Amino acid sequence: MLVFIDDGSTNIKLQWQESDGTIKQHISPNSFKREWAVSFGDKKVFNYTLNGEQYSFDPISPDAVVTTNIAWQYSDVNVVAVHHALLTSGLPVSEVDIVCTLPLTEYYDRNNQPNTENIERKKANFRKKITLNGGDTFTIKDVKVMPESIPAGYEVLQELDELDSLLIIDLGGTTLDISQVMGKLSGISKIYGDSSLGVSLVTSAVKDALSLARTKGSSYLADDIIIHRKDNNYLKQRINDENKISIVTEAMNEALRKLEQRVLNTLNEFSGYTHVMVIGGGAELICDAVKKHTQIRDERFFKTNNSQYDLVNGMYLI
């Protein structure tokens, strides 16, 4: 099979069609500790070994390595993460072939051409050899790359025309990727990638707030707080023992407001967009401010019900 992995910093997204026309979407959060897991026998398992150090999954605790740093797309951790995600697919273990991502800024340069060097460093990373203990790993044979902007506009761009342009706003954990594509993928006017502007901004405050609230925890738990920002009762079941939900919520809310400003300022680098779309899990978080700031009328704004998956789906339906 050719199988699609959108390897994001925080979540691996898979698209893959079992020959029965069965196209499947499978997501896997990345949260890895640099040591093995301790067993009590009932499929408690998934300890991986690669180039000295070893790893195993941990969703909940600190010293799961933080992956918001830029160079995640050449990390050894990345290889671990992707293997682990595909090992929980429900696929027949085998050799297979894949397509993966690069961030917008990685492919390109001063004269807006493919950065073959960085593209190939990427391909080479998935050659690294890795062992899971009691069990065989899938083998990853052929690798190719796509950028992280275009394909999420795919369907919408089709029924657009030839003289108009769709602004695709991709906000991920690490990177804000913006592209303007004129009227189908007939043309791509302008791209922009800002690897310092991600959802990380608030997560990496709220981590510190949770530590103040005596809940020193994983990045994943912190994101779980951000996802359920609206229910104070839910947050009671996660913030360890306090009336100081109050310290955390306000610190979270302040830093949330301060994300918007810098993201919107970045948008005013582009103009002449006829249609505007917002994809990525972070779309949920900024959607209304964007829609309102760009004065687009309802029919020209498309924001989907599974924003998190738009990109890998697009990669597939090319």
Ligand X SMILES: Nc1ncnc2c1ncn2[C@@H]1O[C@H](COP(=O)(O)OP(=O)(O)NP(=O)(O)O)[C@@H](O)[C@H]1O
Q: How many C-beta atoms lie closer than 10 Å to residue 201's C-beta?
A: 18
Applying CB under 6 A, the span of 139-147, 158-166, 182-190, 282-290 interacting with ligand X comes to: 282-290
Nearest residue to ligand X, using CB?
172
Q: Which residue has the tokens 């899971």?
A: 132
Name 141's Cβ contacts closer than 8 Å, sequence gap at least 6.
95, 96, 97
Which residue's CB is nearer to ligand X, number 102 or number 160? 102
Name 26's Cβ contacts closer than 8 Å, sequence gap at least 6.
13, 14, 16, 85, 88, 89
Q: How far apart are CA 241 and CA 144, in angstroms?
A: 48
CA distances from 318 to 131, 165, 267, 312, 315 (A): 32, 20, 27, 10, 5
User: Choosing among a second copy, ligand X, none, which partner's interface includes residue 217 (Cβ < 5 to 8 Å by kind)?
Assistant: a second copy
Which residue's CB is nearer to a second copy, number 138 or number 217? 217
Residues 221-280 that bind a second copy (CB under 8 A): 221, 224, 237-238, 240-241, 254, 257-258, 261-262, 268-269, 271-274
10 binds ligand X per the rule CB under 6 A: yes
Applying CB under 8 A, the span of 14-22, 122-130, 179-187, 281-289 interacting with a second copy comes to: 179-187
Q: Which residue has the tokens 């390109």?
A: 108
Write down how long the chain is: 318
Q: How far apart are CA 222 and CA 20, in angstroms?
A: 39
Tell me which residue of 99, 116, 223 sits closest to 150, measured CA to CA.
Answer: 99
For the window 99-138, what string marks contact with a second copy as x by the rule CB under 8 A? ---------xxxxxxx------------------------
Residue 318 burial (C-beta neighbours within 10 Å; 0-12, 13-18, 19+):
exposed
Residues 196-215 that bind ligand X (CB under 6 A): 198-199, 203
CB of 182 to a second copy, least distance (A): 5
Applying CB under 8 A, the span of 91-99, 280-288, 290-298, 307-315 interacting with a second copy comes to: 290-298
Residues 225-244 that bind ligand X (CB under 6 A): 226-227
Which residue's CB is nearer to ligand X, number 8 or number 314? 8
Which residues make up the interface to a second copy (CB under 8 A)?
Answer: 34-40, 42, 44, 51-54, 58-63, 69, 71, 108-114, 150, 161, 163-165, 182, 185, 187-191, 196, 205, 208, 214-217, 221, 224, 237-238, 240-241, 254, 257-258, 261-262, 268-269, 271-274, 295-297, 300
